[model samples]
Target: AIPAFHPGELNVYSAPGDVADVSRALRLTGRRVMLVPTMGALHEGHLALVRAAKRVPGSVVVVSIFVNPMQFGALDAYPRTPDDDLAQLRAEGVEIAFTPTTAAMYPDGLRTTVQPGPLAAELEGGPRPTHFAGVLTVVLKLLQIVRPDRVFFGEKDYQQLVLIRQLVADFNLDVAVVGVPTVREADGLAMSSRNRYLDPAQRAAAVALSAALTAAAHAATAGAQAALDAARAVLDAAPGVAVDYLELRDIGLGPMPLNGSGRLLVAARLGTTRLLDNIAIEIG
Candidate 1:
């Protein structure tokens, strides 16, 4: 059932099964709709998407907060607070919020799933093999439920964004996928919901992730090797940080062309919190 709207709060729908009806009930006033998907813990990065959604004339911004269990392992730290998240969304001028329960999203006998193809087998997917499969399936479901004209995704998850674009084209889905630039802190660390897990020292060390990408971006003009080396040097100096992978690949996660544009992506663990970031780079 859809909850009663608070005096100043937006409409909140807790059931995935009810999303379509709830969205239509709003009468959305015939306004175009834009969807921004998240795993809760609203922050500036997420708010950035909400702000972008507002840029679309006559758009009814709808944000979905669903903690996908399949994206991370049992040991991974996934933070969630529905009340606070709803409050944040309300403050941000979001018109609709969907908070789907596990059972509502995946029925008891759920078996059908979305296969994201070879693109799902690279980068983040290589480590978390089942990650994209879960993400694509849930996102497809949300798209079907919301039926938004467009959706927003942060470029911090560059590979994921690319794959999502491909998912839409391959399936001939009728929705636009917009990639928003990654929001960062004054120190260059990418804004992430997981940043709350970083302790003081760990937080300080996490800056190296973005610093390395910056170094690579500066050296990319020389060559890919020089770019990688520059980034490696920065990561090597940061203590208590375990580098997972630092690679230079085409924006689409393919081999880098000799003198074309690409991205410098890196993943590292500060204590138990895993942080990933990337930056566009041009090789000469």
Candidate 2:
């Protein structure tokens, strides 16, 4: 029909057990698999990861399209689901789209958490302390089920990518953790599923984010603090934007971490919507 995309074909898993069942079966046949985890809202940025996964020496490219509640921390109040994008993902050559319910994941008495140690308290970790724990826990659970040889993550949220990479290495998980470069808009704004939260005026104001970060790189000399201050000044100039925790932290959670050698993490509110973004510049 439409040119066989993944000749191995895609399998669908709804519940948690089904994922493990299908993946285990695939592994027995000596088929390499890759996972591309996402929260639905399938955009071109996400599709790129799927295409990349297909080329990742795997027989199956499964995408877990669940909006993990634990990973969202207390921000699980939003009830958004990709009723349409699920079909879009299927159309975009996704082999399997594993969608699991909260009950299936947590059960009635599930209370296990996979922490990323100290690395979870810097950059995005500092503001959303519970975020990485949730992320790693769910990812670990997925690894147990999907058992993919590799998992692809986009570097749009650089800090999250770093923490996920660290968890895989520290835990000695037998899977290759790979990251794709961040996909940006023509205007240089990082692509995020949550970007839809921005309204008309706020959307226009949102451009100031990358604009400020870019200016920071240009304005700074040799000091990391100098770069941070420059970006902060830009955030301060935006109308009705409340700075959350703008900071520069080392790549790894380190003691007395130098400024520019780390990343500039920003979380702020433009009206009622809360937006998070970061800029990582190597001072070394």
Candidate 3:
């Protein structure tokens, strides 16, 4: 049966078909459907997406919490806090929550999946190998399942942001993809579920990732090289940080041009925790 959906109240649905049915019912009533797809473990950053979705007047915000196995390298160690996640959703006044199982999503295992564009093969994708493919795949599934009028994703995953738009555009999906700015901790760490894995000292050092990217953003006034140096200098200051690759690329993650907008991307290993962050750049 379709989950009983109450507008302005949190309604949790586990079956993929149930959520789809509720969404269809919602749209029939002329309510815009807004989707925020996430793996459980709700944090302030994820809440930002929820809030954005909720802002659409008379829209039903459907938040899905499925830790897609296709997106992970190998494993179940990823956090799962459905109880707390639902509590936060209730507090936020989210209307629909979709928590599908692995079997529900991949009924016959991953027979067919989304193949993201070339951008997926660079930056974070370069390291994770098949990470974006898994992301695009699950996101496509959610888009089809929820049939939302608009979908929201965080800018913290800058590369993922671009590829998602590519997916929607190339696939000709009607839903609008909104990229919410990355929310951060007071200490300047971009809020990530993985941040909790950092030891106290490692957590303190993790700030370097954001700090470097921010520095690059400001230093960019002098030109791309100066921006690159400013960010590298900050990472160098933190001896504990293992710099993965810090590069200044076009806003689309391509080679920097003589002028216009760009982005400074950073990824580093702080102990066992890998920190990632990026900041916008502008040039002459």
Candidate 4:
């Protein structure tokens, strides 16, 4: 039975059995469910996805909270939530939270992986080779378990969102892939859970990312060469930020959409954590 407070709900779960259980419950209700998967540390950006998920009819918004270690690259820190909590999310209108175990997800000797062929070999993937492979593999697994009719992802991670959308098309996952608009701070800095890791000065530097990306977005509409020039100018303004990669790609993440309808991508370091962000625009 749906709780009065949960007439329309949002939730986070972390157990394999619980995930399967929710699927069973939703099926019993004969209502289509929508999933918004995340790695805890929920912020306004993630909340934006939650709101998007709930927009669908009969949608039981399920937020999965698990930081897959396979994507960590051995050097990056994958922050796991403190003891899985469903109540906190319940207040936000989550119906069921599916939290699965790493052991259950990988099994004892799982050896295979899912790679996006050459597509995952560029941009963020170029530097972090194992990243997209791990992301795609686990996301596929999540889809199988949650089995939602649709999944919501934010444009803050536009590259990842585009890749997942493409994978669904190429591989026929049979699930609708939706990218929600990104949520940002008052100063226009993209809201990321990882923002908690930033110190005061680093926090100030974080806004530079959006500032620079905005310039790129403007330049993109002007011309490809101009976009690069604007993006590089932002990087040049920031002193401590070690630029990782700043490039433009099509709205669908298919090669660079030189004609127009591309997005500006930025990845740089403010402090201990590396931040990534993007802005979408049409060059025409």
Candidate 5:
């Protein structure tokens, strides 16, 4: 049986087929479908994606909240607040929420999965080899299940966003991938569900990541080396931040294009939390 979809009210579905059927029904009625895939514990950053989706003309936003276990290594301490998540979705006027189960998503187990490009082997994926594979697999699954006209992601996860674009292109996926700018706190910390793990002092030091990226973006007008030095000077003085990588690459994450656009990416560990940030660059 096809699930009933109530316009202007949140319709939540745990089964893939139900969402797929309603999405098709909505499309037949000329409604545009937009997707925002998330792992529960909704934050300002996640809401930013939902808001972007909601603004699309005649768009019926579908926000999926599943904390994919395959993406984690040791623990599932990944926070979850399903009740609050639904409440926020309802308030935002999101039309559908695809909250599926692990067993439902992978009924036959992970016999086959997506193998992402070389870009997946570096940066954030460096330490977590199987991370991007799991991500691509789930994202691909969502794209197929909802068959959304467009998908939304946060630029806070720059590499993940890049790999997802690669997935869309390589697999000939029909959906357009839209990246919403990284939302930050008033004092310049990128919002994350994992931020709760940070002690007060660690939280203060964490701002350096966003601060460094801001300085680097401004300093980039001088040269690539200057941008690197500016970000390093800021991160170097920060307490408890063990720098993992601070690389300046092409906007495409390749070797920097001389006197043109580039990207400065940084990652560091503070307390139990790992911070990631990147800024657009225009070399002088």
Candidate 6:
């Protein structure tokens, strides 16, 4: 018997089997189940996902907070926020927190992987080729284990959200994928775990990332080339900013359409912190 909620404590599951067991019990009760996958450091952006999950009438939202090493660069340093993460989840009324250990997830001998198709070879993939591979593989594993009726992802990682939806559709996975609008600070910078690493001066300068995306989206009214120029011009003059990429792609990560929907995605480094943001572009 799996309990749905606690008086004050959050129901935490660190093993895949345990989460599956609880999910099974929830389904047996005729209740829907939703999943929110994250790498911890729970911010308002993540809480927005949980709130979206709760809107799916009678759904039990299970959030998986795993800092996947497979997705990290060889020399990248990622901070952990387990204690603060659980506290915030509790406050948000999240039903379960699946905090699995690396050993528990990978076990002793694991060699399988899920390779993404051509859609992943552009933009973010150009610099970190293996990033989305690790993301999809782990997401596939979680989807198998949690087996939720719906999965919620933030549009902040617009490219990742698009890729996961593709993975689900291509594989015939039985879950509805939903994208929550990105949450931003008052200054317009998209909320991200990495934002914590930025110093005050760097943080002030990082707003250029969002500003560039906005400029591109606004210029989209004129033309695609105009949009690109608008974004590049902003980045070219932004202080303490180094543009890694500013690209426009269709909703499916293909080349932008002539006069239709597209996305303006930007990734840049401010001082030492790398930030990413995107805006929906309507080329009319």
| Leading candidate by lDDT | 5
Relative to the true structure, candidate 5 reaches a TM of 0.98
**Best by TM-score, which number?**
5
Per-candidate clashes, comma-separated: 0, 1, 0, 12, 0, 0
For residues 1-284, write the lDDT of model 5, one tens digit per residue: 67898988999999999999999999999999999999998988999999999899999999998888777764466687899999999888887999999999999998889998889889988899889898999999999999999999999898898899999999899999999999988998888877878999999999999999999999987898898999999998899999999999887788988779888899999976888888888898
Q: Which of the predicted structures, 3 or 4, would earn the higher TM-score when compared with the native?
A: 3
Give every collision pair in model 6.
none
Q: Over the stretch 105-128, how does candidate 1's per-residue lDDT look in tens digits?
A: 888634898888797887788778
lDDT per residue as tens, model 4, 117-229 = 67688888877888988888888888888788999998888878888987788788989998898898899888876788888888887888898888877777578888878
The weakest ten consecutive residues by lDDT in model 1 span 1-10
Please, what is the whole-model Cα lDDT of each candidate in the order they appear? 0.86, 0.74, 0.89, 0.77, 0.90, 0.87
TM-score of each: 0.92, 0.84, 0.97, 0.88, 0.98, 0.94
lDDT per residue for candidate 6 within 29-121, as digits (tens), equals: 888989999988788999999999988888788999998878765523566778998999888888789999889888963498888987787
Error of 3 at 10 (Å): 1.3
> Could you give the candidate ranking by TM-score, starting with the highest?
5, 3, 6, 1, 4, 2
| Better structure of 4 and 6 per TM-score | 6
| Segments of candidate 1 deviating more than 4 angstroms | 1-9, 22-28, 74-77
* Model 3: CA > 4 A from native: 1-3
Which of the predicted structures, 5 or 6, would earn the higher TM-score when compared with the native?
Answer: 5
Name the lDDT of candidate 2.
Answer: 0.74
Residue 239 CA displacement from its true place in model 3, Å: 2.0
Question: What pairs collide in candidate 2?
Answer: 10-95
Runs with alpha carbons beyond 4 Å of true place in candidate 4: 1-18, 75-77, 83-87
